Structures are given as C-alpha cells and as structure tokens.
Amino acid sequence: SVDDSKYQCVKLNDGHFMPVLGFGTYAPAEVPKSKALEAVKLAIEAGFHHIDSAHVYNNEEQVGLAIRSKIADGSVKREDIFYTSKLWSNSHRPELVRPALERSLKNLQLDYVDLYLIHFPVSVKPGEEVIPKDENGKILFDTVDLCATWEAMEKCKDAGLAKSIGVSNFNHRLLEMILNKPGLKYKPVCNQVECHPYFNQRKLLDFCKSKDIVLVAYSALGSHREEPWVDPNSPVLLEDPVLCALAKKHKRTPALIALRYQLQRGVVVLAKSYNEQRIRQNVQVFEFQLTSEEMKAIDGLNRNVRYLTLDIFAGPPNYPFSDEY
Amino acid sequence: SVDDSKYQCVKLNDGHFMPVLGFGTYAPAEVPKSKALEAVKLAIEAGFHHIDSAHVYNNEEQVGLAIRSKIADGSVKREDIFYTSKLWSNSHRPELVRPALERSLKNLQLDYVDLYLIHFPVSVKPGEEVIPKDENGKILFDTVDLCATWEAMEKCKDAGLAKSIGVSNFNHRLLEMILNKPGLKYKPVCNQVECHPYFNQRKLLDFCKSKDIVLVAYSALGSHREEPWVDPNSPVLLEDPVLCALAKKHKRTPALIALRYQLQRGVVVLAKSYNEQRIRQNVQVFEFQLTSEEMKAIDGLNRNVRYLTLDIFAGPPNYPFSDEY
Numbered sequence: 314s315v316d317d318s319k320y321q322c323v324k325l326n327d328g329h330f331m332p333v334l335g336f337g338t339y340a341p342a343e344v345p346k347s348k349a350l351e352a353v354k355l356a357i358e359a360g361f362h363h364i365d366s367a368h369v370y371n372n373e374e375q376v377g378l379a380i381r382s383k384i385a386d387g388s389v390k391r392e393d394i395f396y397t398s399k400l401w402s403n404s405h406r407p408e409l410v411r412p413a414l415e416r417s418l419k420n421l422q423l424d425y426v427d428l429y430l431i432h433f434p435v436s437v438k439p440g441e442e443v444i445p446k447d448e449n450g451k452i453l454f455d456t457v458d459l460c461a462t463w464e465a466m467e468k469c470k471d472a473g474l475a476k477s478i479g480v481s482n483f484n485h486r487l488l489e490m491i492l493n494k495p496g497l498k499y500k501p502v503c504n505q506v507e508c509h510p511y512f513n514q515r516k517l518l519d520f521c522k523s524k525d526i527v528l529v530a531y532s533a534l535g536s537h538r539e540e541p542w543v544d545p546n547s548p549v550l551l552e553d554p555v556l557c558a559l560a561k562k563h564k565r566t567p568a569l570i571a572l573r574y575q576l577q578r579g580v581v582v583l584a585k586s587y588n589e590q591r592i593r594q595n596v597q598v599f600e601f602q603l604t605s606e607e608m609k610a611i612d613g614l615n616r617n618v619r620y621l622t623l624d625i626f627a628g629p630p631n632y633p634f635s636d637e638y
Numbered sequence: 639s640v641d642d643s644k645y646q647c648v649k650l651n652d653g654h655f656m657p658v659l660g661f662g663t664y665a666p667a668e669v670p671k672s673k674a675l676e677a678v679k680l681a682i683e684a685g686f687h688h689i690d691s692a693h694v695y696n697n698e699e700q701v702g703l704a705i706r707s708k709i710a711d712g713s714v715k716r717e718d719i720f721y722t723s724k725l726w727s728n729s730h731r732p733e734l735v736r737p738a739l740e741r742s743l744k745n746l747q748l749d750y751v752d753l754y755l756i757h758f759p760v761s762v763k764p765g766e767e768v769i770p771k772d773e774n775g776k777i778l779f780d781t782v783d784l785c786a787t788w789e790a791m792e793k794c795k796d797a798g799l800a801k802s803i804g805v806s807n808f809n810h811r812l813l814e815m816i817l818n819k820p821g822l823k824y825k826p827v828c829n830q831v832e833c834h835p836y837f838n839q840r841k842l843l844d845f846c847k848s849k850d851i852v853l854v855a856y857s858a859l860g861s862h863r864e865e866p867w868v869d870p871n872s873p874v875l876l877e878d879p880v881l882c883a884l885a886k887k888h889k890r891t892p893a894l895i896a897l898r899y900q901l902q903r904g905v906v907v908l909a910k911s912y913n914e915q916r917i918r919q920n921v922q923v924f925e926f927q928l929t930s931e932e933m934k935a936i937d938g939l940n941r942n943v944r945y946l947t948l949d950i951f952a953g954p955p956n957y958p959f960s961d962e963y
C-alpha cells in the first residue's frame with residue numbers, strides 16, 4: 314500500500330534505531346515449528362520490521378529461514394529487519410557468551426543480530442539442558458558475575474556480531490549494577506520485561522527513561538498462558554471491560570488497545586501471533602490513537618498481576634521479581 | 639552518525655509517514671529572506687527530515703534551493719525530505735487552490751510537496767495582495783465554503799501535487815465541518831496549531847487523536863515574538879523556572895525540554911532556528927527522555943497563553959480562537 318519504505322522506530326542510546334512494534338515468536342512446544350517459519354514470513358509481509366526470538370525458543374533455524382526467504386524474494390532488505398536474539402542462562406559465563414551467540418547465528422544463517430539480550434539474570438549450570446535439574450527437580454544454579462557477562466556482550470558488539478546489546482527481566486538493582494560497572498563501554502539499549510495494563514511497570518519504565526533505556530514489553534496481550542509458567546487462575550487481560558469499551562469506541566479490538574497503550578507511553582511493544590488474521594490485525598496499532606482520557610483509564614487497570622513469575626528460578630539474589638521494581 | 643538512514647516518524651491517516659521533528663522556516667521581517675537558504679541546509683545536515691514553510695513566508699525560492707542543493711550534493715534523497723507548504727487565505731476559493739499550489743511548486747522547483755495545509759480558516763479577497771484592505775484600512779474578508787476549498791485540496795492530492803493534505807489553525811468546529819463533509823475523500827492528516835507548555839492544547843489534542851489527526855505544534859519554543867503579532871509583555875516560555883530546572887537536571891536546555899514534552903505526548907513538533915548551534919542542539923531531542931512525573935510537572939505549566947492570536951482576522955465565523963477549543 315501507500316508507503317512501505319518507512320515505519321515507526323525509536324533511536325536507541327547507541328545510535329541504532331529499533332522499530333516500535335516487534336513480532337513475538339515464542340510458542341508452546343506442542344505447536345509445530347513449521348508454524349514459526351510461516352508466521353514470521355506472514356509478519357514480514359504484514360509490515361513487521363522487528364522480530365523477537367531467543368536461543369531457548371528452539372526456533373532460530375525457522376525464524377532465520379523466514380527472514381532469508383523474505384529477503385531473497387525481494388520483500389524486504391536485511392537493513393530493514395531488526396532481529397533480536399537472547400543469551401540463555403546456561404551461557405552466562407563470560408567464556409560461553411560469544412560461543413552461544415555464534416551458535417545462534419549459525420542456526421539463523423545470518424551474519425549478525427540487530428540486538429542481543431541477556432535473557433534472564435539467574436544463571437544455571439552450563440550444558441545442553443536449558444533448565445538443568447537435580448533428582449528432585451530443583452534447578453542447578455550457577456554462580457556468575459553478570460558484570461563479566463556484560464563485558465563479554467560488549468565484545469560481541471565490538472566484533473560486529475550484535476549491532477546493539479541489552480537485557481531482559483532486569484530490575485532496578487541489576488540495571489544499576491551494569492550502569493555503575495567500572496569500565497562500562499556500552500549501556501544496555503533496552504530492558505525487555507513483562508508489561509501490560511495489569512502490570513504496567515510504571516516505576517521501572519520511569520527509571521529506564523531517566524537512563525535513555527528503552528523498555529520493551531513482552532506479554533503485552535496477557536501472555537501465552539502456558540502451564541505451568543502462567544497460573545491458570547490469573548485474569549485474562551483481553552476480557553477486561555475497560556479494554557473492551559475502548560476497543561468498541563475505536564472500532565478496534567482489546568488487543569489493539571493494549572498495544573497502542575504501550576506505544577503512547579514510550580514503550581516498544583511485542584505481539585506474538587501465529588494466526589494470519591491476527592498478525593495483520595496487530596499492525597493496525599499505527600492506524601489510531603488513544604486520547605489522554607483513554608490512557609488514564611488504562612493506567613487505572615494496574616493491579617499487580619505478573620503472569621510470568623519464573624519462580625522456579627527464585628532464591629539467588631539475581632532473581633529479579635522480589636524487589637518492588 | 640551510527641545510522642543516519644533511519645529517523646523517527648509517525649504514520650499519518652493516509653498511510654504516508656511524517657518525521658516527528660520539523661524545521662520551522664519563518665523569520666521576522668527585519669531578517670533577509672536569503673538567510674533561509676543556509677538555515678535549511680544546516681537543518682538538513684543536522685538531521686532534520688521535515689521542513690515547514692508556506693506561500694506567505696516569502697521564502698519558498700530559498701527553501702526549495704536549499705532542499706535541491708542537499709539532494710544534489712548527496713546529503714539526502716527527496717524521499718527523505720518531508721516538505722510542507724500552506725495555502726494562503728487569498729486562495730481559499732476552490733478554483734484558486736491548485737493555482738496556488740502550482741505557484742509554490744514553481745517557486746520551490748519541486749514536483750510535489752509532501753504536505754499541503756489550509757494555512758488559516760478566515761478567507762480574504764483574492765488577488766495579489768495577501769492582506770487586501772478597503773479605503774478605511776479594513777481587511778476585505780471573503781465568504782468561502784471551506785468544504786469546497788477542501789475538495790480542491792483532495793484533487794491536488796489525487797493529482798500527486800501534494801502527497802498528503804491537512805489544515806492549520808482549525809478549531810474543533812472547523813475540524814468537524816471537514817470530517818462530516820458529505821462525500822469526504824481524505825481526512826486532514828494533521829492540524830498545525832500553536833502548542834507549548836503555556837498553551838498545551840489538551841482538549842484539541844485529544845480530539846485530534848480520537849480521529850487519528852496528528853497535531854503539529856508551532857511556536858513550540860514560545861514563538862518568534864515578532865511585533866505586532868506577539869505582545870512583548872507575554873511571558874517568555876524559555877525562561878520558565880520549571881523548564882529551566884528540568885534542563886539543568888538533565889544537562890539539556892529549556893528548548894530541549896519543551897520539544898521532548900511534545901514528542902512524548904504524541905505531537906509532531908516544529909522548531910525554528912537560524913543559528914547553527916541551536917539547529918544542531920534541537921536535534922538532541924532524540925537523545926533523552928522525560929519521566930511521568932516530569933511530564934506531569936510540564937502539564938502543570940498550562941496557563942492560557944496564546945502568543946499568536948492573529949486577531950486581524952477576527953470577526954468572521956471561521957475565526958478559530960473565540961471558541962473554547
């Protein structure tokens with residue numbers, strides 16, 4: 314249609330530009346990986362320019378192939394795709410960071426990722442098991458200085474393997490640990506965290522904005538709800554009457570209201586869908602705007618509901634969700 | 639620059655994209671119209687991608703030479719410049735709209751403008767005089783249905799002469815008159831109006847966002863303060879003590895705080911400067927962010943100061959500033 318050469322982005326603190334709507338690629342293991350290949354191709358056709366994955370999603374072969382397929386048919390150029398990967402917690406030791414990035418890049422068959430994140434701040438012992446456990450099912454925790462992990466991330470950006478580097482699931486204290494590290498070369502460009510109208514992350518968002526860190530929202534639609542990661546008793550975000558009222562007023566959908574909320578408060582928003590219609594629906598976030606009154610109504614929904622506690626990882630001080638923010 | 643091929647823009651309701659920081663080109667009458675040439679070149683070199691002018695500014699020859707110079711020297715391509723002109727009030731009759739646009743294009747030596755606006759909703763008699771007057775010195779107003787003016791603007795867009803069309807200095811009533819016009823083809827993409835912390839336009843802004851009309855703020859730095867247009871005893875925006883204290887806290891400037899405020903509330907902001915350092919300074923709006931409490935402090939500065947009343951045009955029903963908004 315009218316002008317597909319341009320799209321909305323935000324300038325990161327390292328000078329790179331991030332598209333403000335990202336396509337989420339995680340799906341529960343029961344969904345065939347074929348659907349990831351299909352869905353990324355559809356997302357790129359629909360106008361997503363930012364694609365979010367991770368080693369632990371076990372889909373980088375498919376996601377990379379979808380990107381390469383869309384480049385080879387002329388649909389998009391590599392410069393106009395912003396691809397994120399993440400370093401899993403079995404590779405936090407500094408000597409394991411670049412090996413893990415190179416392994417992701419070999420799976421993707423890409424030369425570089427646009428963004429590499431520390432996925433989660435609790436370290437687990439190295440090896441092929443992504444969640445290694447003892448005989449009673451308790452995680453095997455590892456002891457790693459994330460400031461040393463971050464210096465290994467910085468060397469990946471100097472090597473050109475990652476254009477930008479950031480973090481995910483960090484709280485205030487862990488962000489200050491990085492920002493205050495002696496000899497810091499690059500600040501994180503982003504903190505990717507759960508964020509939606511039931512857990513709007515006000516306080517953490519303000520801190521990130523005070524440092525020119527972009528907050529990137531995952532579970533912006535209320536999450537995948539996969540058991541046993543998400544409590545099935547938790548409220549379903551998109552049933553909320555305020556979201557539904559706003560959707561009816563705008564002739565949009567609750568999902569669109571939840572995405573647009575994030576864009577207007579300065580957050581970069583992810584959205585996963587493997588459904589062709591809903592992929593195309595989600596790019597309609599650029600076709601309407603919420604009034605101040607509507608933003609205030611959504612701010613009023615905040616209610617302390619964290620879908621993704623990751624509490625199997627609790628105990629070490631780097632477990633990020635016990636602090637206020 | 640790390641990546642000067644990307645820059646922050648917003649999608650308009652016609653599918654075109656507008657860069658969110660625009661360069662203002664009006665300068666008071668004591669400044670030679672020639673000075674616009676260098677200023678616009680320096681704006682483009684600094685990273686402005688949106689340049690705002692108008693037939694009545696008497697600078698489109700210079701503005702157009704600057705734009706063509708920076709294309710010819712390889713600094714930017716035409717698709718990375720978003721240029722706005724405006725239809726003066728002696729050309730509101732529908733028969734006269736296209737003629738006026740063609741005259742601006744001949745002066746610019748461009749094939750199209752990216753945006754053509756109705757400059758001000760009060761019509762004056764057609765002819766060479768921009769402010770025609772009778773023998774007693776009274777302005778000669780003209781009775782024109784701006785719906786018919788708008789249909790002529792629609793035809794300019796269909797001809798390709800304007801990629802997008804919008805309005806300026808419209809109030810709620812006048813916007814509604816356009817949006818409710820029978821047989822409307824294209825909504826206005828924007829309403830360019832005075833907007834700054836002393837006149838934050840909340841109500842009109844919300845109305846525009848409810849219709850997916852972008853509000854574009856002029857006089858965002860407190861205006862050119864040219865007599866007789868602006869009263870010299872109006873308060874000087876950039877001396878405001880809250881803006882100055884936020885500037886000192888951020889190691890920025892009061893101008894930068896006023897520009898960033900607008901970006902965060904979803905406004906596209908203009909900034910005129912003919913000073914090389916200030917032009918470069920203003921592009922730093924993309925380098926920092928304001929917290930929610932800082933935004934609320936700036937919201938609290940609102941105080942009903944309209945610098946540009948343009949009351950020479952008061953009397954006709956279309957004069958826009960007698961209604962509440």
Ligand SMILES: NC(=O)c1ccc[n+]([C@@H]2O[C@H](COP(=O)([O-])OP(=O)(O)OC[C@H]3O[C@@H](n4cnc5c(N)ncnc54)[C@H](OP(=O)(O)O)[C@@H]3O)[C@@H](O)[C@H]2O)c1
Pocket residue numbers: 336337338339340365366432481482505506530531532533534535536537538551566568569583584585586587588591592594595621
């Ligand atoms: N960094 C981390 O630790 C972390 C954690 C979680 C997620 N993430 C990233 O963020 C992404 C998004 O978060 P998420 O996977 O929790 O899910 P999400 O984006 O909050 O929601 C996905 C759910 O919403 C549905 N959906 C999507 N569009 C919809 C629409 N327009 N209307 C109604 N329902 C809609 C999806 O179903 P369909 O697919 O059937 O449309 C899926 O069931 C992930 O895929 C991943 O890339 C990161």
Ligand SMILES: NC(=O)c1ccc[n+]([C@@H]2O[C@H](COP(=O)([O-])OP(=O)(O)OC[C@H]3O[C@@H](n4cnc5c(N)ncnc54)[C@H](OP(=O)(O)O)[C@@H]3O)[C@@H](O)[C@H]2O)c1
Pocket residue numbers: 661662663664665690691757806807830831855856857858859860861862863876891893894908909910911912913916917919920946
């Ligand atoms: N649609 C309309 O009816 C309408 C009305 C008015 C304006 N406009 C458009 O909006 C543009 C901007 O509005 P405006 O001309 O009233 O002025 P403005 O952008 O509010 O600026 C006022 C003044 O600020 C000074 N300045 C600029 N940057 C500065 C900085 N970083 N620190 C300190 N001072 C700074 C400039 O002086 P220096 O040049 O010396 O830096 C300028 O004179 C116009 O030029 C025009 O393009 C449209």
Ligand SMILES: C[C@]12CCC(=O)C[C@@H]1CC[C@@H]1[C@@H]2CC[C@]2(C)C(=O)CC[C@@H]12
Pocket residue numbers: 339342369370371433443444542623
């Ligand atoms: C389920 C799965 C992904 C698939 C798998 O084989 C096991 C692994 C366990 C860890 C999970 C991960 C999905 C993404 C999750 C949910 C996180 O973001 C933190 C822990 C992650």
Ligand SMILES: C[C@]12CC[C@H](O)C[C@@H]1CC[C@@H]1[C@@H]2CC[C@]2(C)C(=O)CC[C@@H]12
Pocket residue numbers: 664694695768769867946
């Ligand atoms: C542009 C503007 C000067 C800046 C104001 O913000 C808007 C004014 C519109 C009317 C213009 C005027 C400059 C002087 C003009 C151009 C005239 O000579 C007669 C009409 C006058």
